[PDB]
Amino acid sequence: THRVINHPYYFPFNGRQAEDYLRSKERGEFVIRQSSRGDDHLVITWKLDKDLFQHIDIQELEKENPLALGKVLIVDNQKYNDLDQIIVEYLQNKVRLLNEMTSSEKFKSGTKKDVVKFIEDYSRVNPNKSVYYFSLNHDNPGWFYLMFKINANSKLYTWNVKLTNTGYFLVNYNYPSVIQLCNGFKTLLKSNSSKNRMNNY
Amino acid sequence: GVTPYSNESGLVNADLDVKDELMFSPLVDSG
């Protein structure tokens, strides 16, 4: 099965071919391609960073025939009219928010181990401060690690922040900016901390 | 198929298991 999709960004790639094509491209570039899930799915594969790619499902509804692009498309549980709307309203916002995160003074580039090392070093120098940074989750594209220590002697905790097209999802909420995500992280942890100290008897 | 769909993953957060006093930097204006 080889579908003729009439779109400037359509390529008949498997996931590995899509990643190879994007390897020399820049953050935010993408391809649309046939899905292994069937003739009512497509995939948009996009580049986050060097050797870091995310493949997102596009579910097709209102198909006029088995091979034609559906007139309604579902991405991340939201409805879109066509592939250009997905590019503009889903993908481009997601890329915008990725750049907002990696431009933040709370973001650290490098592998998880690299950032843990910086956190440990920072904690060694500042043993009575609580420390936290964001970094890229290379094993789960589209997520950030949120790593923190309460103090030098505390364990290093890893939480997980999901990048979405409308903000940064942490625990129960989709923060619309990195500043609000940082404020919210602190509030959430203050709340859990004060709950731990409650006297239930 | 073989391709992973990382937007479909769910990653579990470690529970905070300490009474230690938090000492994070201040909250800041959202702008």
Author numbering:
A (entry chain A): 1250 to 1450
B (entry chain B): 1469 to 1499
Paper excerpt:
Phosphorylation of CTD residues is thought to recruit multiple co-factors, including the essential and conserved transcription factor Spt6, which directly binds to and co-localizes with RNAPII at sites of transcription. The C-terminal region (residues 1250–1440) comprises a tandem SH2 (tSH2) domain that is tethered to the core by a flexible 21-residue helix and contains both of the two known SH2 structural motifs in yeast. The N-terminal module (nSH2) resembles a canonical SH2 domain while the C-terminal module (cSH2) is vestigial and does not conserve the residues that are normally associated with binding to pY-containing peptides that comprise the vast majority of known SH2 domain ligands. We therefore took an unbiased approach to map the tSH2 domain binding site within RNAPII and, contrary to the earlier assumptions, found that Spt6 tSH2 directly binds the flexible, 86 residue Rpb1 linker (residues 1456–1541) that tethers the heptad CTD repeats to the RNAPII core.
To visualize the basis for this interaction, we determined a crystal structure of Spt6 tSH2 in complex with Rpb11468-1500 pT1471,pS1493 (multiple attempts to determine the structure of a complex with Rpb11468-1500 pY1473,pS1493 were unsuccessful). The unit cell and space group were the same as the earlier pS1493 complex crystal, and molecular replacement followed by refinement against 1.8 Å data to Rwork/Rfree values of 16.2%/19.8% revealed a very similar structure, with additional electron density corresponding to the N-terminal region of the Rpb1 peptide that includes pT1471. The unmodified Rpb1 Y1473 side chain occupies the typical position of the phenolic ring of pY, while the phosphate is instead contributed by pT. The phosphate is displaced 3–3.5 Å from the canonical location, and is hydrogen-bonded to the Y1473 hydroxyl via an ordered water molecule. This allows many of the interactions that stabilize binding in conventional SH2 domain interactions to be conserved in the Spt6-pT complex. For example, the water molecule that bridges the T1471 phosphate and the Y1473 hydroxyl is anchored to Spt6 through hydrogen bonds with the hydroxyl group and main chain nitrogen of S1285, which is analogous to the SH2 BC2 residue that in many SH2 domains is a serine or threonine that hydrogen bonds with the tyrosine phosphate. Similarly, Spt6 R1282 (SH2 βB5) hydrogen bonds the phosphate, as it does in canonical SH2-pY interactions. The 3–3.5 Å displacement of the phosphate relative to conventional pY complexes allows formation of an additional hydrogen bond interaction with the main chain carbonyl of Spt6 G1264 (SH2 αA2). In many SH2 domains, the αA2 residue is an arginine or lysine that forms a cation-pi interaction with the pY, so a glycine in this position may open the pocket to allow the displacement of the phosphate seen in our structure.
